Amino acid sequence: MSLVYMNIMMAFTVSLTGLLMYRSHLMSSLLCLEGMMLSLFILATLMILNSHFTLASMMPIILLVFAACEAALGLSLLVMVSNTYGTDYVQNLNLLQC
Amino acid sequence: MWFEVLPGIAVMGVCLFIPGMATARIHRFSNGGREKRVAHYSYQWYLMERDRRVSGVNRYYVSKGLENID
Amino acid sequence: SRGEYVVAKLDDLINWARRSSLWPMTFGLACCAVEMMHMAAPRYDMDRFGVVFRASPRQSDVMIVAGTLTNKMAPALRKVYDQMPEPRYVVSMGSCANGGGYYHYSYSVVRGCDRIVPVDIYVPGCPPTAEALLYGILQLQKKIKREKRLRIWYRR
Amino acid sequence: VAAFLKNVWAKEPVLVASFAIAGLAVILPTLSPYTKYSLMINRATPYNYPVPLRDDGNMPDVPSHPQDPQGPSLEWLKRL
Amino acid sequence: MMTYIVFILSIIFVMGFVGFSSKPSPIYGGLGLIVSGGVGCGIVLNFGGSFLGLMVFLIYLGGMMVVFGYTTAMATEQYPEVWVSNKVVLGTFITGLLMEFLMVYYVLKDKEVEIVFKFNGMGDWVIYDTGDSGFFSEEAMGIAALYSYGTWLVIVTGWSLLIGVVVIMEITRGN
Amino acid sequence: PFFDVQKKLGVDLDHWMTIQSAEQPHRIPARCHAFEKEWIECAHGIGSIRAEKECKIEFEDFRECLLRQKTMKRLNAIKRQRDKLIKEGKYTPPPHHSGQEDLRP
Amino acid sequence: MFMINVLTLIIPILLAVAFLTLVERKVLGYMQFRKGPNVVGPYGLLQPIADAIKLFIKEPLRPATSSISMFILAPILALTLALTMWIPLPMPYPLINMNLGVLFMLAMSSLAVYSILWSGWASNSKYALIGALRAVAQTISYEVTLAIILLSVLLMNGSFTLSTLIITQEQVWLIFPAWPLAMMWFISTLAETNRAPFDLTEGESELVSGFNVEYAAGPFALFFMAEYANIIMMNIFTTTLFLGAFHNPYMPELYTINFTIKSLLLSITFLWIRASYPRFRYDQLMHLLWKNFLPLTLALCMWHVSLPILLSSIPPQT
Amino acid sequence: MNLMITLLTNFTLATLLVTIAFWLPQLNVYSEKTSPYECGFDPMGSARLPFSMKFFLVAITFLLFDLEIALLLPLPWASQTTNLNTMLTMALLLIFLLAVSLAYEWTQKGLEWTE
Amino acid sequence: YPTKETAHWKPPPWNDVDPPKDTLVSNLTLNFGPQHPAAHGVLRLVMELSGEMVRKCDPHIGLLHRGTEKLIEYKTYLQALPYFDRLDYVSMMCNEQAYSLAVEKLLNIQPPPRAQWIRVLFGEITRLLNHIMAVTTHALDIGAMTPFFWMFEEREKMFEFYERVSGARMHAAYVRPGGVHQDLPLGLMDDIYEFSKNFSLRIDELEEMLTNNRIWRNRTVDIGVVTAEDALNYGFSGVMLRGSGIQWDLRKTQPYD
Amino acid sequence: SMMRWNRERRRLQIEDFEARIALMPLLQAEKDRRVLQMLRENLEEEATIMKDVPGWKVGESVFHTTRWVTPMMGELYGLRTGEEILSSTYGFIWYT
Ligand SMILES: CCCCCCCCCCCCCCCCCC(=O)OC[C@H](COP(=O)([O-])OCC[N+](C)(C)C)OC(=O)CCCCCCCCCCCCCCCCC
Ligand SMILES: CCCCCCCCCCCCCCCCCC(=O)OC[C@H](COP(=O)(O)OCCN)OC(=O)CCCCCCCCCCCCCCCCC
Ligand SMILES: CCCCCCCCCCCCCCCCCC(=O)OC[C@H](COP(=O)(O)OCCN)OC(=O)CCCCCCCCCCCCCCCCC
Ligand SMILES: CCCCCCCCCCCCCCCCCC(=O)OC[C@H](COP(=O)(O)OCCN)OC(=O)CCCCCCCCCCCCCCCCC
Ligand SMILES: CCCCCCCCCCC1=C(C)C(=O)C(OC)=C(OC)C1=O
Ligand SMILES: CCCCCCCCCCC1=C(C)C(=O)C(OC)=C(OC)C1=O
Ligand code: SF4
C-alpha cells in the first residue's frame, strides 16, 4: 500500500509499546492511550478520505468522542489513585497480590 | 482635553487601514485588475484550472472571450 | 570621526528610550509611599512622563525606596533590587531611606538604603512632596540623558 | 403555577429565559406552516446533475426540454 | 521533495509519537502529543478533511490543556524529566528516532519496504482521485449525514456522554 | 449470539454505513463502487466457503482498487526504468512530459 | 507577490499594537481624571517607540530554575499565534481565504493558551504556577461556550467561511437577530483574551504578574504585544461576526474604513471596560460561563437550529 | 502553500525578535539576579510540588462537553439535508442530552469547587 | 502453599477496607511577601494553600518595626509628638489628637474651645483622608483601579488644607498637647466649605461605581464574616465591630473634645 | 430581515447551481478527452521506456475486468514534472 500508512501504523506501534511498557507513572501512559486514539483517527481517516467513502466520514468524529469518553474516564480513575496516595505511581497499586 | 486621544487612535486607525486595503490592491495586481478568484469548492478550482489551461499564457486570470473562437 | 558621531547618536537614542520609558515598581515601605501614590495621582501624574508601575522586578527599571528600611526587610530589599535587570536605578525617597531619618538612632533601622543598594537620586523630605518626588524622577531622567555608554565603549 | 414561576423568575431569571427559549425551540417548529417549505427548498436545491432518461415511449410526465411545461417547477419559491 | 509533503508531516508525526511514548514527563508528553496532533491535522488535511483535521487538532488541544492541569496537580515530581534527565527515556527516544529514520532511509532508497504489510516508497500523491466533488467537500456532506442518517449513532453517542458524566461523578466522590 | 434484531424488527440501525455501495448522501460514489458492487452481487447468498473460491477474481479486483498495490508496483517499475534510462543517457523525455505542449481544453 | 502581502499584513498589525499601547494609556488616563503620555512625543505619539526600544536593550534574564527550552518557546509561540490569527479575517479580502476559517480561529485560540501555560510552567515560580493554572481554569470555562455561541451565529451564515459572513449581513447586521449571542460572545472574548474584569492570569493584585512574572524585558515584550494583537484581532472578529459592513466589489476601501472604525470602537470599549470594573474571582468566572452563559447558550443553540427550519430561512452553504 | 509560507514568516520574525532580544543588550549574570521571585524573601520549597486542583470534576466534564462541539458542529451543514425533521429531532436530542448532563452535574454539586 | 516469595503476604482485611496510610498532603507554602501591590508595603504572609484555598495565614510583621516607642522614651513630649504622625500615616492628626489628649489628661489641663473645634474639624478631614485611602485601595486591591484616581484629587485638596494650616501636606505636628500650634489662616474655612459643598458628589460617584455593582458584591458579600462575640474576643474596634452590628463608637460612648 | 435575505440567497444558490449543471456536459466531454489524451501520452511513452525489459507487457491492466477504471493520480501525472504534479494533486487544497 501507500507510503503514509507505514508511518501512521508506525506511530500506532510506537504508542502501543509506550503504553504497554510502563515507566512507573500513570498520566504518561494515559497520554499513550490518547496517542493510540490519535493514530487510529488519522489512519482510518486517511483510508476513508482516500477511498471517498463519504458516509463513514462521520466515523472518526464518533471515534474521537469515545476517545475522550474513556480518556476523561482515566482521569476520573486517576484522582482516586492520587487522593489515596500522594502520587500516581503504578507500583503503589500492588495491594491485590495477596 | 479628551480629544488628545484622537491623534493616537487615528494613527492606530491608519495601522489598521494599511493591511486590508493593500491586499485588495495586491489581489488586483496579481490577478489582472480584478478580484482574486475564490475556489472554496473543487468545481470552482476545476473552472480556474480550465482558465489556466485555455489562457495560452499559463495564467488563470488572462481571460479569452469570443475573440478566441472564430 | 564618523564612528564617534554614530555612537553619539545611538547613545542619544538609547538614553532617550531609557529615560522616557522608566517603569518603577510597586514598592513602598512607609509614609512616603502614600505621597508616591500622590505622585501617581491625577494632579502630578507620573504616567504622562512614561513613568508607570510594573509589580515585578524583572520588568521594572527604577526602584523608588519610599519609606523606612528596617533590618528585617533589608535582605528583601536587596533581593528585590538584585532581581531587577540592568540597567536598574534607585531613587531614595524621604529621610529614612536617605540617611535613617527620624529613626536613625534606632536598633532596628538601616541608616539609609545606600548601605544596601547603590543609590542614584536622593529625594529629601519627611515626606518630600509628590512634586519633589517628581522633581527627583525628572532629575533621574536628566542623569540617564547624559550617560555615555556607547561612547565609552567606542573609546575603550 | 404563577407563584412558583414568579419565585424562579425572581431567583433564577437566566434559567427561566433558558427554559422558555428551549421550550419554544421544541414546540414551535411543530406549529409553524413554514417547516414544509424548508424541506421543499432543501430538496429543490440542485447539487448533483439531473441525469437524463432513455425515452422508451411512455413517460408523459417527463419533459424533453427544460423549458417544457411538465416537470417540477419552483414558482412557489419565486413567490412565497 | 515537495510531493512527499504528507510523508514529511508523517515523519514529524512519528517523531512526536517517539517523543511522548518514551514518557519523559506529561508536560513534555503533552508537548509531543500536541506536536503530533498538529502535524497530523496537516497529514489528514491534505486528503480533503479540513473539518475532520481541525477537529482532531482542537479536541486534543483542549485535552492536553486539561491533562496539563492534572499533571501539574497530580502527576508532578520535584525534578520532571525533560528527555535526558533519565537514561532510559533518552535511550528509548534515540532508539525510536534511529529506527524511524532507518526505515525512512530504507524506503526512500528501495521505493518498496516490507514490515508486516508491504508499503510503496513513492509519494502518496499518486493515489488521489482525478475528479472534482462539485460544490461540496465530500467529508462535509458525510459528517453532516450524522443527523439525517446516523440517528442510532447519535442516540448511542449522546447516551454514552450522558452516562459518562454520571459515571465520572459517581467515581470522583469518595463515598 | 448474533441476535439479529434489525432483520427481525425491521429497523435499519447500522446497515447504511456498512458498505460503500449503500445509499450515499447526494449520490456521492465511492472510488471502488463498481468493484464492491460486483464483489457483493457475486458472493450474495452462496456462503463464505463458496465465496472465498468462486468470487476470488472480483475480490482481487476490488482489493486492488482499494490499496492500489499492483498499480503502484507497476508505476514503481515504470518510474524506476525511466530514471535508469535518464541516468544512462539512453532516453530523453517528450515535450509533453516537460511542459511545452499546449494542454488540451 | 504574496510575501509582500504577508509583510503588509503583519507589520502594520504590529504598529497597531504599538499605538494601541498609547491609546490604552491615554484613554485609561482620561477615564481616570488624569492624562496619559504627552511628554515623550507630541501628545504621546512617540511613547510606544520608546517602550519598544527600551524592552530590547534591557537585560533578558533567563532564570536559574527555568526550564529554558519551553521558557524561550513560550513567547515565540505567543507572538506566532498572535500574528497568524489575522490571516482568515476578511478585510474585505482575507490573506488566506479558508473554507473553514472560523474553526481555524477557534483552534488557534486553543493553541494560544499554551504560550501562557508553558510560560507559567517553565518559569519555575510559584506565582507563575498560579497564573498558569488560572489560565487552565479560565480556558475550560470560556471554551465550553466559545464554540456553541460561534456555532449558533453561523447557523444564519451557512458555513464557517468568514468571507461569506459579509454576504450574510448585506441587509441587516447580525447583531439584530442575535444580540443575546452577541452580548454573550463579547464577554466570552473578554474572558478569552485575559482582559479585565477577567484578567485572572496577569493578576496585578492577587499575583505579582502571574505567568510572566519571571519574564524580563525582551521576552516580556512578546507576551504583551501578543495580547494586544489578540484583542485587536478579536474585536475585528467580533465586528465581522455581528457588525458586518457594506461591501462594494469595486470599492473595497469603503468596507475597510467601515470595519476599521467599528473595531476601533470595540477596542475603545475593551479599554473602557478595563477602566471601570473590579476583577472577578476566578471561580466566579467559572460559575458564570458554566452556570449562567452555558444554559442560555444551549437554549439559544436549540433556537438557532430550529428557527431557520421554522421560517424556511436556512442559509446556503455555497 | 501560502499557509506554510505565512506560518514560517510569523514564526521566523517571532524568533528573530527573540534572538535580537537576547544578544543585543549587555548582561551581568550572577546567581542572585536569576534566583526565583518570591516577593523578596527566599522561596520555601519548589514550585514543582503538587498544586492541588479544586476544579477537577469540571476539568473532567470539560473533556466530555468539548466533544459536543465536535458533534454539534455539522449543524450548519446538517440543515442542508432532505430529511429535515429527523435532523431537527436528533439535533435537539443532542443539545437536550448535553443539557440533562449539565443539570445532573448541577444538582449533585459537581460544578462547585471542593473545600 | 507458602514459598519464599509468598511469605510476606498477609491475608487481606475482612471488609476489604484498608487503612488510609495518611501521607501528608504537603500544602503549598506561598510567601505573599512584602514586595507586593496587595500586602501594603510591609507584610509577609506565609500562607499555606491547598492550590489556592487558604489553609493557614501567618503574617510576619515587624518589617516596619522602627522601634518608635523606645525612641519616645529618650525624647521630650513635644519631640515625641511627630512620632505619632508616622504611625497611622494616613490618619495623622487623629494620632496627634490621641497623644495630645493623653498628655493633657496627665497634665490636668484642657484645650481652649476653638482649638477643640479645630481638632474635631481636622479630625473629620483626617477621617475623610483615611476612608478615601481605605475604600480606594481596597478596590485597587480588588481591581477597581479608577475611583482611586478619582478620589485622590479630593485627597490632594485636603492635603492642601493641611499644607495651608500647618505647612506640611502629611505630617503636620499641628495638634499639640495644649491645643494646636497655630491658628487657622484667613480664607481657610471658606475653602473647606467649597470642598465640602462638592465632596458628596464624589462619594456618590464612588458609590455609583461600586455599591450596586454585581462584580463588587461577588467579591465582598460572603467574604470575611466576623461574628460579634469573636469580634469582641479578638479585640476588634471601629468598623470591624460596626460591620458586625456592635453599636459602639467612641465619639458617642466615650466622647472627646 | 434574515428570513427574506436567506430565501433570496437560496434562490441565488439555485441559479448558480443550474449554471453549473448547464455547463457540466461540455466540461465532462473535455475531461474525458483530457484523461484519454494523458493516458495515451503515457502509454506511447511506456513502450519506449519499457523496451529492453524482459517479460514486460505494455498497457497491461492490473485488473482482471475489462470495465473502465477511473485513472488514478499516479496513472496520469506519473511521468510528468513536479510543477504539473503539485498543481494537479494538491492544488485545490493549497490554494489560498
Ligand atoms: C458585541 C457587541 C456588544 C454586545 C454587548 C456587550 C457590551 C456591553 C458590555 C458591558 C460590560 C460587561 C463586562 C463584563 C461583565 C461580567 C458580568 C456579567 O455580564 O455577568 C452576566 C450576568 C450574570 O448575572 P449574575 O451573576 O447576577 O447572576 C446571579 C446568578 N445566581 C442567582 C445563580 C447567583 O447575566 C447573565 O448571565 C445574562 C447573560 C445575557 C442574557 C441575555 C438574555 C437575552 C434575552 C432572552 C429572552 C428573554 C425572555 C425569555 C423568552 C421569551 C420568549 C417570548
Ligand atoms: C502608519 C503611521 C505610523 C506612524 C508612526 C510614527 C508616529 C509618530 C510620527 C512622528 C511624530 C513627531 C516626532 C517628533 C520627533 C522629535 C522632533 C524634535 O523636535 O526633535 C528634536 C531633537 C533634538 O534636536 P535639537 O538639536 O535639540 O533641537 C533644538 C531646536 N532648536 O532631534 C531629534 O529628535 C532628532 C531627529 C529625530 C527624528 C525622528 C522622527 C520620528 C520618526 C518616527 C519613525 C516612523 C516615521 C514614519 C514612517 C512611515 C511613514 C513614512
Ligand atoms: C515544540 C512546540 C512547537 C514549535 C513550533 C511551532 C510552529 C507553529 C505552530 C502553530 C501552527 C500550527 C499549524 C497546524 C496546521 C493548520 C492547518 C490550517 O491552517 O488549516 C486551516 C485551513 C483550512 O482551510 P480549507 O478548508 O482547507 O481551505 C482550502 C481548501 N479550499 O487550511 C488551509 O487553508 C490549507 C492550507 C495548507 C495547509 C497545509 C497543512 C498544514 C501544515 C502543518 C505544518 C506543521 C504544523 C505544526 C504544528 C505544531 C503544533 C505545536
Ligand atoms: C421542555 C423545555 C426544554 C427543557 C430542556 C432544555 C433546557 C435548556 C437549558 C439548559 C439548562 C441546563 C442546566 C439546567 C440546570 C437546572 C437544575 C438546577 O440548576 O436546579 C437548581 C436551581 C436552584 O439552584 P440551587 O440548587 O439553589 O443552586 C445553588 C447555586 N446557585 O433550580 C431552579 O432554579 C429551578 C429550575 C426549575 C424551574 C424552572 C422553571 C422555568 C419555567 C419557564 C416556563 C416554562 C418552560 C417549559 C419547560 C417546563 C418548565 C417547568
Ligand atoms: C512595537 C510594540 C511595542 C510594545 C510596547 C510594550 C510596552 C508598553 C507597555 C505600556 C503599558 C500598557 C499599555 C498598559 O496597559 C499598562 O497597564 C495599565 C501598563 O502598566 C502596567 C503599561 O506599562
Ligand atoms: C496603581 C496606583 C498607584 C499604586 C502605587 C503603589 C506603590 C507601592 C506603595 C506601597 C503600598 C501599597 C501597595 C498599598 O497597598 C498601601 O495600602 C494603602 C500602602 O500604604 C500602607 C503602601 O504603602
Ligand atoms: S522619611 Fe519620614 S515621612 Fe517619609 S516615609 Fe520616612 S518616616 Fe514617613
JSON list of N, CA, C and O in Angstrom, two decimals, chain G residues 123-141:
[
{"chain": "G", "resi": 123, "resn": "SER", "atom": "N", "xyz": [8.97, 28.86, 33.65]},
{"chain": "G", "resi": 123, "resn": "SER", "atom": "CA", "xyz": [9.49, 29.77, 34.67]},
{"chain": "G", "resi": 123, "resn": "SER", "atom": "C", "xyz": [9.08, 29.20, 36.02]},
{"chain": "G", "resi": 123, "resn": "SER", "atom": "O", "xyz": [7.96, 29.39, 36.47]},
{"chain": "G", "resi": 124, "resn": "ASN", "atom": "N", "xyz": [10.01, 28.49, 36.65]},
{"chain": "G", "resi": 124, "resn": "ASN", "atom": "CA", "xyz": [9.73, 27.64, 37.81]},
{"chain": "G", "resi": 124, "resn": "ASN", "atom": "C", "xyz": [9.51, 28.53, 39.02]},
{"chain": "G", "resi": 124, "resn": "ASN", "atom": "O", "xyz": [10.35, 28.65, 39.92]},
{"chain": "G", "resi": 125, "resn": "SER", "atom": "N", "xyz": [8.34, 29.16, 39.06]},
{"chain": "G", "resi": 125, "resn": "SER", "atom": "CA", "xyz": [7.99, 30.05, 40.15]},
{"chain": "G", "resi": 125, "resn": "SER", "atom": "C", "xyz": [6.57, 29.76, 40.59]},
{"chain": "G", "resi": 125, "resn": "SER", "atom": "O", "xyz": [5.76, 29.23, 39.84]},
{"chain": "G", "resi": 126, "resn": "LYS", "atom": "N", "xyz": [6.30, 30.13, 41.83]},
{"chain": "G", "resi": 126, "resn": "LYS", "atom": "CA", "xyz": [5.05, 29.76, 42.46]},
{"chain": "G", "resi": 126, "resn": "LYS", "atom": "C", "xyz": [3.91, 30.64, 41.94]},
{"chain": "G", "resi": 126, "resn": "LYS", "atom": "O", "xyz": [2.83, 30.13, 41.62]},
{"chain": "G", "resi": 127, "resn": "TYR", "atom": "N", "xyz": [4.16, 31.94, 41.81]},
{"chain": "G", "resi": 127, "resn": "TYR", "atom": "CA", "xyz": [3.16, 32.84, 41.24]},
{"chain": "G", "resi": 127, "resn": "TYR", "atom": "C", "xyz": [2.93, 32.56, 39.77]},
{"chain": "G", "resi": 127, "resn": "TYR", "atom": "O", "xyz": [1.80, 32.69, 39.28]},
{"chain": "G", "resi": 128, "resn": "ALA", "atom": "N", "xyz": [3.98, 32.15, 39.05]},
{"chain": "G", "resi": 128, "resn": "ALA", "atom": "CA", "xyz": [3.81, 31.75, 37.67]},
{"chain": "G", "resi": 128, "resn": "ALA", "atom": "C", "xyz": [2.99, 30.47, 37.56]},
{"chain": "G", "resi": 128, "resn": "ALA", "atom": "O", "xyz": [2.21, 30.31, 36.61]},
{"chain": "G", "resi": 129, "resn": "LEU", "atom": "N", "xyz": [3.13, 29.58, 38.54]},
{"chain": "G", "resi": 129, "resn": "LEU", "atom": "CA", "xyz": [2.33, 28.35, 38.55]},
{"chain": "G", "resi": 129, "resn": "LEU", "atom": "C", "xyz": [0.87, 28.66, 38.80]},
{"chain": "G", "resi": 129, "resn": "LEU", "atom": "O", "xyz": [-0.02, 28.06, 38.18]},
{"chain": "G", "resi": 130, "resn": "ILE", "atom": "N", "xyz": [0.60, 29.60, 39.71]},
{"chain": "G", "resi": 130, "resn": "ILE", "atom": "CA", "xyz": [-0.78, 30.02, 39.96]},
{"chain": "G", "resi": 130, "resn": "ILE", "atom": "C", "xyz": [-1.36, 30.69, 38.73]},
{"chain": "G", "resi": 130, "resn": "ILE", "atom": "O", "xyz": [-2.50, 30.41, 38.34]},
{"chain": "G", "resi": 131, "resn": "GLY", "atom": "N", "xyz": [-0.58, 31.55, 38.07]},
{"chain": "G", "resi": 131, "resn": "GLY", "atom": "CA", "xyz": [-1.05, 32.19, 36.85]},
{"chain": "G", "resi": 131, "resn": "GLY", "atom": "C", "xyz": [-1.24, 31.26, 35.68]},
{"chain": "G", "resi": 131, "resn": "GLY", "atom": "O", "xyz": [-2.03, 31.56, 34.78]},
{"chain": "G", "resi": 132, "resn": "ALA", "atom": "N", "xyz": [-0.54, 30.12, 35.67]},
{"chain": "G", "resi": 132, "resn": "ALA", "atom": "CA", "xyz": [-0.75, 29.14, 34.61]},
{"chain": "G", "resi": 132, "resn": "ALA", "atom": "C", "xyz": [-2.00, 28.30, 34.87]},
{"chain": "G", "resi": 132, "resn": "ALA", "atom": "O", "xyz": [-2.81, 28.07, 33.96]},
{"chain": "G", "resi": 133, "resn": "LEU", "atom": "N", "xyz": [-2.19, 27.84, 36.10]},
{"chain": "G", "resi": 133, "resn": "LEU", "atom": "CA", "xyz": [-3.38, 27.04, 36.33]},
{"chain": "G", "resi": 133, "resn": "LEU", "atom": "C", "xyz": [-4.64, 27.88, 36.44]},
{"chain": "G", "resi": 133, "resn": "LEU", "atom": "O", "xyz": [-5.74, 27.36, 36.23]},
{"chain": "G", "resi": 134, "resn": "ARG", "atom": "N", "xyz": [-4.52, 29.18, 36.68]},
{"chain": "G", "resi": 134, "resn": "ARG", "atom": "CA", "xyz": [-5.67, 30.05, 36.48]},
{"chain": "G", "resi": 134, "resn": "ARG", "atom": "C", "xyz": [-5.99, 30.25, 35.01]},
{"chain": "G", "resi": 134, "resn": "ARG", "atom": "O", "xyz": [-7.15, 30.46, 34.67]},
{"chain": "G", "resi": 135, "resn": "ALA", "atom": "N", "xyz": [-5.00, 30.11, 34.12]},
{"chain": "G", "resi": 135, "resn": "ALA", "atom": "CA", "xyz": [-5.31, 30.08, 32.70]},
{"chain": "G", "resi": 135, "resn": "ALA", "atom": "C", "xyz": [-6.00, 28.78, 32.31]},
{"chain": "G", "resi": 135, "resn": "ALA", "atom": "O", "xyz": [-6.86, 28.78, 31.43]},
{"chain": "G", "resi": 136, "resn": "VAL", "atom": "N", "xyz": [-5.63, 27.67, 32.96]},
{"chain": "G", "resi": 136, "resn": "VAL", "atom": "CA", "xyz": [-6.38, 26.41, 32.78]},
{"chain": "G", "resi": 136, "resn": "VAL", "atom": "C", "xyz": [-7.83, 26.58, 33.21]},
{"chain": "G", "resi": 136, "resn": "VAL", "atom": "O", "xyz": [-8.76, 26.24, 32.47]},
{"chain": "G", "resi": 137, "resn": "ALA", "atom": "N", "xyz": [-8.04, 27.12, 34.41]},
{"chain": "G", "resi": 137, "resn": "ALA", "atom": "CA", "xyz": [-9.38, 27.34, 34.93]},
{"chain": "G", "resi": 137, "resn": "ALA", "atom": "C", "xyz": [-10.17, 28.36, 34.13]},
{"chain": "G", "resi": 137, "resn": "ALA", "atom": "O", "xyz": [-11.40, 28.32, 34.14]},
{"chain": "G", "resi": 138, "resn": "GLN", "atom": "N", "xyz": [-9.49, 29.28, 33.45]},
{"chain": "G", "resi": 138, "resn": "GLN", "atom": "CA", "xyz": [-10.20, 30.23, 32.61]},
{"chain": "G", "resi": 138, "resn": "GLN", "atom": "C", "xyz": [-10.54, 29.65, 31.25]},
{"chain": "G", "resi": 138, "resn": "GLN", "atom": "O", "xyz": [-11.63, 29.91, 30.72]},
{"chain": "G", "resi": 139, "resn": "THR", "atom": "N", "xyz": [-9.65, 28.83, 30.71]},
{"chain": "G", "resi": 139, "resn": "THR", "atom": "CA", "xyz": [-9.87, 28.31, 29.36]},
{"chain": "G", "resi": 139, "resn": "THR", "atom": "C", "xyz": [-10.91, 27.21, 29.36]},
{"chain": "G", "resi": 139, "resn": "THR", "atom": "O", "xyz": [-11.75, 27.15, 28.45]},
{"chain": "G", "resi": 140, "resn": "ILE", "atom": "N", "xyz": [-10.93, 26.37, 30.40]},
{"chain": "G", "resi": 140, "resn": "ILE", "atom": "CA", "xyz": [-12.01, 25.38, 30.50]},
{"chain": "G", "resi": 140, "resn": "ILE", "atom": "C", "xyz": [-13.35, 26.01, 30.82]},
{"chain": "G", "resi": 140, "resn": "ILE", "atom": "O", "xyz": [-14.38, 25.35, 30.69]},
{"chain": "G", "resi": 141, "resn": "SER", "atom": "N", "xyz": [-13.37, 27.28, 31.22]},
{"chain": "G", "resi": 141, "resn": "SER", "atom": "CA", "xyz": [-14.61, 28.00, 31.40]},
{"chain": "G", "resi": 141, "resn": "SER", "atom": "C", "xyz": [-15.08, 28.67, 30.11]},
{"chain": "G", "resi": 141, "resn": "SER", "atom": "O", "xyz": [-16.26, 28.58, 29.78]}
]
